Amino acid sequence: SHMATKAVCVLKGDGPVQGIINFEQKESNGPVKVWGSIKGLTEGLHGFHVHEFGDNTAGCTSAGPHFNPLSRKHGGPKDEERHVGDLGNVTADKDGVADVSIEDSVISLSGDHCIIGRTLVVHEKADDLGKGGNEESTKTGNAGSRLACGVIGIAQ
Amino acid sequence: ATKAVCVLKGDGPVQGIINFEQKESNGPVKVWGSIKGLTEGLHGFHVHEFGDNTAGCTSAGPHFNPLSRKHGGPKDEERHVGDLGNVTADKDGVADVSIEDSVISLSGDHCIIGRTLVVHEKADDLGKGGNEESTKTGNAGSRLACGVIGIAQ
Ligand SMILES: [Cu+2]
Ligand SMILES: [Cu+2]
Ligand SMILES: [Zn+2]
Ligand SMILES: [Zn+2]
Ligand SMILES: [Zn+2]
C-alpha cells in the first residue's frame, strides 16, 4: 500500500530557472505522465533527467549521476539502451518558457524503478541522446551544467 | 542500511541539513544535523504528508498522519507518525539535532522518503495545550523552513 500515484517537483537553482513539474501514474506498471512549466530558459532544447540522489546539499551537483539502476549507457527516452532517468529534452519557446508534457514507461512512481525521493534536473544545453560520439555522450548526453533541480516528492 | 537527507529552506533565516539513517528494516531511524537561524528555544519538528513545495512550506500539508490519530509527543502512543517532538536552538540560534524514532521509517508502507521535514516557529506543546490546535499542530505556529526528504548516498 501507499504506492504513490502523484508526485511533484519544484525546480530551482542559482539562476533564473525555475518551474513546477507534476508526475502522475494511475496504474502501478503503467506509464508516468510528466507535465508542467519551466521558465527562465534559453530558447531551444534542454536536457531533462531524473538523477540518482535527492541530495541538494551542494546545489544540483549533489544530486549525482542519472538514475541508472540497470547500469545502462545514456540515451534518449525512446531508445532501449538508456538510463532509467533519461527523459530526453524539453523545449523552451522564444520567451524562455518551456511547457512540458511527456509520458514515460520506464520510470515509475513505485517499485524498483521508483523515482520518489530523487532529483529532477534540467540542463544548460540539449541532450544529445547519446549520439554525440564521445564517452561523455554515453554518460550525460553532453547536456552541460545543471540550471535547476528539486527533489521529487509525494503530492496530495 | 537506508540513508536519506533534507535541506531545510524558507522565506526567512532558518536553514539546515538533516540526515536520516535506518540501518535495518522496521527499525529505528537516526535523525541528526544542524539548523541555524532559529530563535533561542525549542521549535516544533515533524514530517508532513506531502513533499509538495509549490506554495512554500504550506503545501506540505499536515503532519504525516497515516493512522489518523491526534497529535502528540514522539514518546506518546497517541501521536502522528510524523510527530518528532521538538529541537532546541541555543543563544547562538543554532540547533544541533539528534533524535531516534522507531515509528517513522525510511522504507516500508509508511516510509517518509519523498515527504517534507518542517521546523516550526514555536515550541510543540505535544498535544497538552488544552485547545483543538494542540491536538492538531501542538501550537508550534508558522512553518519557518522545510525541505523534501530525499534519497542520499
Ligand atoms: Cu540531468
Ligand atoms: Cu510540522
Ligand atoms: Zn542518462
Ligand atoms: Zn497506511
Ligand atoms: Zn503531529
Numbering used by the authors:
A (entry chain B): -2 to 153
B (entry chain A): 1 to 153
From the paper:
Human SOD1 (hSOD1) is a highly conserved 32 kDa homodimeric metalloenzyme, with each monomer containing a zinc cation (Zn2+) for structural stability and a copper cation (Cu2+) for catalytic activity. The well-established ping-pong reaction mechanism of hSOD1 involves the sequential reduction and reoxidation of copper by two distinct O2− anions.
In addition to 1 Zn2+ and 1 Cu2+ cation per monomer in the metal-binding sites and a total of 503 water molecules, the final model also includes 4 sulfate and 4 acetate anions originating from the crystallization mother liquor. The Zn2+ cation supplemented prior to the crystallization formed a center of symmetry (ZnCRYST) and glued four different chains in a near-tetragonal geometry with angles of 95.03°, 90.99°, 84.18°, and 97.95°. Initially, the copper active site predominantly adopts a distorted tetrahedral geometry, where His46 coordinates through its ND1 atom, while His48, His63, and His120 coordinate through their NE2 atoms. The stepwise coordination of water molecules within the copper active site orchestrates a dynamic sequence of conformational changes in the catalytic region, guided primarily by the positioning of the bridging His63 and the copper-coordinating His120.
